[PDB]
Design a protein around this ligand. Structure first.
Ligand SMILES: *[C@@H]1O[C@H](CO)[C@@H](O[C@@H]2O[C@H](CO)[C@@H](O)[C@H](O)[C@@H]2NC(C)=O)[C@H](O)[C@H]1NC(C)=O
Ligand SMILES: *[C@@H]1O[C@H](CO)[C@@H](O[C@@H]2O[C@H](CO)[C@@H](O)[C@H](O)[C@H]2NC(C)=O)[C@H](O)[C@H]1NC(C)=O
Ligand SMILES: *[C@@H]1O[C@H](CO)[C@@H](O[C@@H]2O[C@H](CO)[C@@H](O)[C@H](O)[C@H]2NC(C)=O)[C@H](O)[C@H]1NC(C)=O
Lengths: 518, 513, 407
């Protein structure tokens, strides 16, 4: 069989760690040794295990709150943020039982459109949003007037600026190429010969020989090649967002999940943390939308035509007359004719379209195969104001949120996150997968790996295509372990997909080998 | 292949009644499905599962499932007490909101925002054997007293005030209340389109003619021979594929403290801690083999068109003719034959998953700027679960607020392992011609693609075409004589009929004793 | 000859059912009346009034602390005073005079028709949908609002329907096949021309699926009453009449939608034939056969599309859209998951289990008793068909007749 399903493999357990003095629990975990692929069996969702403990030792109490404590959330909030007219808890505790609530933001104020998306962490290795890490609805007062057009906004406490730095870059490149070549010949041969004798002597003798020969040859060959490349792209930018550098108010959920992290290092918990919330958070971003269109046409026609003819004639007549008469007429011929015609017509077309940001109406109409009307591009860019994608991102790793202001043992947790994150970058890399066929890209998807098959390819491994051969791009295998310290080094065999096969495409990226101080 | 025969659906005898469960006053018993009805034949009227009223002679000693937590009367949902009188009915009983003297016990002023539309399907269980929604696993309507909202980026909706001439967008539905079980519900407008189109057309023609003539006359003899062959070959192949995938949401389900649906909760507590296959089988059949924990919400369109045309024509003729003269005699003979064969086959599949019956039908009929735009508009209102990740139904238990449940969880794992290889579609017989076997309840179908007809898709309007094999069901486990057990399966249900693909997976399976 | 149908003797009379005042007989259908014999229209069962030989063991029961309505249904007290009609004839609400509290506090919610009809009864014999046995006007005091999805109108999902998801799908599937041959050649000799064409087109639309609640399900009063009015003994005719009025199954889940289909087949052959025995023949035959089907949607659009579909006319997508949109008004149950109707016979009822078993057996006998299996064979292997009370077969070839007896 061509395919062979490969089941998930994951390691034997770690040791149990020692009982966590605060969590009164102990932990155990396993590493994903091999993701399941090609419809292999998926492993049980138990790469983590947990146990309860006796309290072999106490630990530090939860960090002192000098402010008010929000009853349900336990958000430590400043006493100036009570009776404020705003919920600063995610709960009414701040405003609960206030004798008088002094509404500061009396006006009608909108939140910045999509601002709460940016409070989500991202998995940088996936570039995909995760659970909320920051609370962008916490205003902590504020109520400075921020306007966009006539619409006035209330900025989150966390956000330093959200400002409509509008810009747009269009780019159109059309390249059409034609070649034709034609070749013909016409060629002809005819030969005729006669020889006869007729004499009187009494006696009479006569002889006649007839020869005719014709040869004809024709050849025709035609090639027609017609090639079109059309790449169009619109980069639209609508707002600039920056997070404040300092004293961020975290989201409750992230706060608590951090609170539950073990003080002893055990990768499984920080792994689950990243899988919930990801690895990084967005300090600065450019918000807008992308449209990108790319069509490839190759039209190749060839014709070949051949004609061959041979003709031969022979007749001979010899007659002797002296009454006596004898005659023979003897004649023979062969005709040969060949016609041979071969024609091939091949058309290969592919299109890819890609859109981000805006309303679904505009997104899909732009997802049709026709280049858009300027009107619909206007309508799309109008609607991107309200539902933009994130074009540019500048990120900081999530551990930079872990701050003593919020968490006991902040340094320890921070360091654990660094270590865990480093291991996480290894374990979640796509390098681990078996190679796709068909120039497919393996996307690791938790414990199993999916081949994103290109346009014109199908099946679990992209094994189905009508194209006989197409360039296969090279893919790195996983980088080696760290070389033992006398200097530090890694290597990549560029092997996992071989770059050369099937008119092999690009070689892999550099570097093939990476070296460092220990 | 001639039609296979019907078989009657067949069930084993009843298992014995379970002892009458003290809290439920119910006896239970199960049959096992020894044979579905397969290619027609008498369906079972018997169900695989049965339950009967029975007084237990013993009290519900366990009824005290919860202490300090507030437990609803109707249902074992135990709530953290801040939720009592919190203003939101946190169980179907509503008792947590009953007799609440303290109106200021309400948690927050959230209710103006309605729940995310379409959030309910993310709640429902999934049955991988039938690809059908089950009952709810998650409580889709539970907020835990929290007021997490979600910015609906498509909130814009034109309104015209005739009295003003103002043309404006109505603010309504600018946000949705996120249900507690959703960790995230990222509105994110994406589209990706991919098209390929490949045309291969080849035509070849040959002619070959021989004449061979001899005449010799004084008595007259004259012999002529002709050989001529003409042979035409044409093959025309068109394949085009369009995949346009639109996304509007990414949603993820919390891995912690999953608030099970009330019905699921009850049904779960009713399960015995001892293994009883019938009970857990019923549970899986109700809530599905699998529950979902990752989502995108989208519309999808796919268009596939394949046309093959081939024409082959041949003429052959020979003659030999001969003559003897001076009285005159003439003879001749030879072989001539003529044939033409031609065929064309064409099919299209156009399918849309997305937000309106009218426009999704229209776009299934007719691809255009008009149907793409109007279907995209319709996706504003009725997006669909376009992709999801899932886990076995038993893994929720680890993640529930309840605790270990590990007896139940292991029982459910065993039951699943069985159920997946009892109600498996493989046990419906060979669907020929790439028909899909389906086992619903106790009964089988073959779903036939349009070329095929009949109970097994067996008869075909044309006489033979490439159709793929499929696996038989796994045999029983061997005895494990060593510490290892074996299981065997053959790519013969059906065999690849005309050299279609051999089915890809393992022929042989092996297992720890 | 035709064969006249035949029936069993009457069974013995049952004993008198002490609560039902009645006695019963059974009568098997020995032969259906093949070849257009006498139809067996006569009743499979019979019943007679009886003055009962013993006192009735009452069918009433004490619901205790539950509210017991004017109808037999008992409901929990909180459902009284809901404003919603939680029982028969508002008796749960006529029980209430003060402090009414709708669970749809401060708002109006539409009643979904697709929810009202969900849970269709089904008879396995022709899979005809009967009316839902579920009382889909029972909300159990909830206000779960859902969008129609094809419209922004929000509707209250009834308690029985665990899910009603507008998981819209549209499909068109098309295939064409064309085949053509020309062939030129005691002994037999023939030369032939042959052409085969097949064309198959169907489209499906899915409006959404309902899933009926596995548990705690509340049924119509007439359904439960008709389970009460049942002999407790097995009485073939009385359970058959129950299954005939409710169906042997219900859809525990189903997809509503619309469907259209067009099939075209053409087969053309020309033959020349000459034979010699130790004749000359010329023949032309043409067969052209077209069928057009539409299901669901409003009549105007459904039929306009179906006619425009049947003609070679190219359909303007606007009319197809108008039909597919009107499917929202008149859906059809295009698919279902079938559960045996006796699974709705509620636990906690007198002889509930026994009536379950008896219905199981009655459905067995009903499948069997109306089985075509006991019709005589077709003479040319055509499909035997059980009509109403008579049996025949049909064959498509030149072999023809009420049993294909000739050709
Ligand atoms: C075999 O029968 C053929 C008809 O059954 C007959 O064909 C006919 O020939 C006629 C002239 O002789 C012609 O006018 C008429 O149209 C017809 N053609 C067809 C297609 O039916 C063949 O001649 C006959 N064969 C022999 C050898 O007599
Ligand atoms: C080979 O001969 C053919 C036949 O004469 C040429 O084609 C003809 O060209 C003349 C003049 O251009 C036209 O008037 C005829 O209509 C053509 N006939 C056909 C059938 O093509 C052909 O051009 C010659 N090719 C070469 C290479 O000499
Ligand atoms: C899809 O449907 C539309 C609407 O019926 C069709 O629109 C027609 O397009 C042709 C050109 O392709 C024009 O000649 C007609 O005037 C158009 N009609 C209208 C009302 O605009 C379209 O042709 C259809 N396309 C396909 C591929 O079926």
């Amino acid at each position: 069989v061509t395919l062979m399903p490969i089941d998930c493999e994951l390691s034997s357990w770690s040791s149990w760690t020692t009982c966590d003095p605060c969590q009164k629990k102990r932990y155990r975990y396993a590493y994903l040794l091999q993701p399941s692929q090609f419809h292999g069996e998926p492993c049980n969702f138990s790469d983590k295990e947990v146990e309860d403990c006796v309290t072999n030792r106490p630990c530090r109490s939860q960090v002192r709150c000098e402010g008010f404590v929000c009853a349900q959330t336990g958000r430590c909030v400043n006493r100036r943020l009570l009776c404020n007219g705003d919920n600063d808890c995610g709960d009414q505790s701040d405003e609960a039982n206030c004798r008088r609530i002094y509404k500061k933001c009396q006006h009608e104020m909108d939140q910045y459109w999509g601002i709460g998306s940016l409070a989500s962490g991202i998995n940088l290795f996936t570039n995909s949003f995760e659970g909320p890490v920051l609370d962008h609805r916490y205003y902590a007062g504020g109520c400075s007037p921020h306007y966009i057009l006539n619409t006035r906004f209330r900025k989150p406490y966390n956000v330093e600026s959200y400002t409509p730095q509008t810009q747009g870059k269009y780019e159109f490149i059309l390249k059409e190429y034609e070649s034709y070549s034609d070749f013909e010949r016409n060629v002809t041969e005819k030969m005729a010969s006669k020889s006869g004798f007729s004499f009187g002597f009494e006696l009479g003798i006569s002889s006649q020989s007839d020869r005719g020969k014709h040869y004809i040859r024709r050849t025709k060959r035609f090639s027609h090649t017609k090639s079109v490349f059309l790449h169009a792209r619109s980069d639209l930018e609508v707002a600039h967002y920056k997070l404040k550098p300092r004293s961020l108010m975290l989201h409750y959920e992230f706060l608590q999940r951090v609170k539950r992290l073990p003080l002893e290092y055990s990768y499984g918990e920080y792994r689950d943390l990243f899988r919930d919330f990801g690895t990084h958070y967005i300090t600065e971003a450019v918000l807008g939308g992308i449209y990108e269109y790319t069509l490839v046409m190759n039209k190749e026609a060839m014709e070949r035509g051949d004609y061959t003819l041979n003709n031969v004639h022979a007749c001979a007549k010899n007659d002797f007359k002296i009454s006596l008469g004898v005659s023979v007429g003897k004649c023979r011929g062969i005709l040969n004719e060949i016609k041979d015609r071969n024609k091939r017509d091949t058309m290969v077309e592919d299109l890819v379209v890609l859109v981000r940001g805006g309303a679904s109406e505009h997104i899909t109409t732009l997802a049709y195969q026709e280049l858009p009307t300027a009107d619909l591009m206007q309508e799309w860019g109008d609607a991107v104001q309200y539902n933009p994608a994130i074009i540019k991102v500048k990120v900081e790793p999530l551990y930079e949120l872990v701050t003593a202001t919020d968490f006991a043992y902040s340094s320890t947790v921070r360091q654990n996150m660094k270590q865990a994150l480093e291991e996480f970058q290894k374990e979640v890399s796509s390098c681990h997968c078996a190679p796709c066929q068909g120039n497919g890209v393996p996307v690791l998807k938790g414990s199993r790996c999916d081949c994103i098959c290109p346009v014109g390819s199908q099946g679990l491994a992209c094994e189905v295509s009508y194209r006989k051969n197409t360039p296969i791009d090279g893919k790195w295998n996983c980088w080696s372990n760290w070389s033992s310290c006398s200097g530090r080094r890694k290597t990549r065999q560029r092997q996992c997909n071989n770059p050369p096969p099937q008119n092999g495409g690009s070689p892999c990226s550099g570097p093939a080998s990476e070296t460092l101080d220990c | 292949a001639a039609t296979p025969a019907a078989v009657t659906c067949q069930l084993s005898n009843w298992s014995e009644w379970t002892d009458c469960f003290p809290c439920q006053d119910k006896k239970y018993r199960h049959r096992s499905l020894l044979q579905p009805n397969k290619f027609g034949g008498t369906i079972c009227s018997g169900d695989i599962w049965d339950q009967a009223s029975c007084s237990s002679s013993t009290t519900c000693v366990r009824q005290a499932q919860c202490g300090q937590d507030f437990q609803c009367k109707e249902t074992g949902r135990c709530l953290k007490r801040h939720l009592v009188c919190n203003g939101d009915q946190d169980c179907l009983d509503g008792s947590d909101e009953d007799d609440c003297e303290d109106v200021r016990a309400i948690d927050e002023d959230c209710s103006q925002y309605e729940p995310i539309p379409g959030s309910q399907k993310a709640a429902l269980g999934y049955n991988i054997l039938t690809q059908e929604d089950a009952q709810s696993v998650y409580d889709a309507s539970y907020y835990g007293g929290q007021c997490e909202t979600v910015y609906n980026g498509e909130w814009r909706e034109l309104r015209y005030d005739s009295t003003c001439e103002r043309l404006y967008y109505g603010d309504d539905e600018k946000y949705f209340r996120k249900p507690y079980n959703f960790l995230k519900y990222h509105f994110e407008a994406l589209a990706d389109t991919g098209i390929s189109s490949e045309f291969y057309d080849n035509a070849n023609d040959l002619l070959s003619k021989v004449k061979k003539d001899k005449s010799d006359s004084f008595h007259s003899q004259d012999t002529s021979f002709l050989n001529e062959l003409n042979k035409y070959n044409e093959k025309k192949f068109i394949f085009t594929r369009i995949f346009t995938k639109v996304q509007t949401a990414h949603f993820k389900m919390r891995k912690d403290d999953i608030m099970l649906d009330e019905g699921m909760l009850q049904s779960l507590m009713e399960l015995p801690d001892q293994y009883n296959y019938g009970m857990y089988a019923k549970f899986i059949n109700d809530y599905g083999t699998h529950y979902i924990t990752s989502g995108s919400m989208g519309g999808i369109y796919e268009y596939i068109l394949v046309i093959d045309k081939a024409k082959m024509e041949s003429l052959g003729i020979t003659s030999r003719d001969i003559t003897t003269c001076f009285h005159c005699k003439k003879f001749g003979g030879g072989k001539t034959e003529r044939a033409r064969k031609a065929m064309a086959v064409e099919d299209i599949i156009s399918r849309v998953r997305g937000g309106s019956s009218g426009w999704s039908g229209g776009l299934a009929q007719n691809r255009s700027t008009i149907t793409y735009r109007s279907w995209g508009r319709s996706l504003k209102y009725n997006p669909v679960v376009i992709d999801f990740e899932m886990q076995p139904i038993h893994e929720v238990l680890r993640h529930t607020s309840l605790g270990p449940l590990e007896a139940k969880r292991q029982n459910l794992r065993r039951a699943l392992d069985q159920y997946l290889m009892e109600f498996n579609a493989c046990r419906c017989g060979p669907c020929f011609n790439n028909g899909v076997p389906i086992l619903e309840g106790t009964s089988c179908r073959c779903q036939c693609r349009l070329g095929s007809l009949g109970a097994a898709c067996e008869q075909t309007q044309t006489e033979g075409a490439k159709a793929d094999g499929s696996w038989s069901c796994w045999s029983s486990w061997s005895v494990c004589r060593a510490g290892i057990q074996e299981r065997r399966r053959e790519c013969d249900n059906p065999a690849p009929q005309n050299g279609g693909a051999s089915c890809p997976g393992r022929k042989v399976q092996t297992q720890a004793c | 000859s035709h064969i006249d149908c035949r029936m069993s003797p009457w069974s013995e009379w049952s004993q008198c059912d002490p609560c039902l005042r009645q006695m019963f007989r059974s009568r098997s259908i020995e032969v259906f009346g093949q070849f257009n014999g006498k139809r067996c229209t006569d009743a499979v069962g019979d019943r007679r009034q009886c003055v009962p030989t013993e006192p009735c063991e009452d069918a009433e029961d004490d619901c205790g602390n539950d509210f017991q309505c004017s109808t037999g249904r008992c409901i929990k007290m909180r459902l009284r005073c809901n404003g919603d009609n939680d029982c028969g004839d508002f008796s749960d609400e006529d029980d209430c005079e003060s402090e009414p509290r709708p669970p749809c506090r401060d708002r109006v919610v539409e009643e979904s028709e697709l929810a009202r009809t969900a849970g269709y009864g089904i008879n396995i014999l022709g899979m005809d949908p009967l009316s839902t046995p579920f009382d889909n006007e029972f909300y159990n005091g909830l206000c779960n609002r859902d969008r129609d999805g094809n419209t922004l109108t929000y509707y209250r999902r009834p308690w029985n329907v665990a899910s009603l998801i507008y998981e819209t799908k549209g499909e068109k599937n098309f295939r064409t096949e064309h085949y053509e041959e020309q062939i030129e050649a005691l002994f037999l000799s023939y030369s032939s021309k042959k052409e085969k064409m097949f064309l198959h087109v169907k489209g499906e639309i899915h409006l959404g699926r309902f899933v009926m609640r596995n548990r705690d399900v509340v049924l119509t009063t007439t359904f439960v009453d008709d389970i009460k009015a049942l002999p407790t003994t097995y009485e073939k005719g009385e359970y058959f009449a129950f299954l005939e009025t409710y169906g042997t199954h219900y859809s525990s889940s189903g997809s509503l939608g619309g469907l259209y289909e067009l099939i075209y087949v053409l087969d053309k052959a020309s033959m020349k034939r000459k034979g010699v025995e130790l004749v000359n023949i010329t023949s032309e035959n043409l067969i052209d056969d077209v069928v057009s089907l539409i299901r669901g949607g409003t009549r105007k659009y459904a039929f306009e599309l179906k006619e425009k579909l049947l003609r070679g006319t190219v359909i303007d997508v606007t009319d197809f859209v108008n039909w597919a949109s009107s499917i929202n008004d008149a859906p059809v149950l295009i698919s279902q998951k079938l559960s045996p109707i006796y699974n709705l016979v509620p636990v906690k009822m007198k002889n509930a289990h026994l009536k379950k078993q008896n219905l199981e057996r009655a459905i067995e006998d009903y499948i069997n008793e109306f089985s075509v299996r006991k019709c005589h064979t077709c003479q040319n292997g055509g499909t035997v068909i059980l009509m109403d009370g008579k049996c025949l077969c049909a064959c498509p070839f030149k072999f023809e007749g009420i049993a294909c007896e000739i050709s």
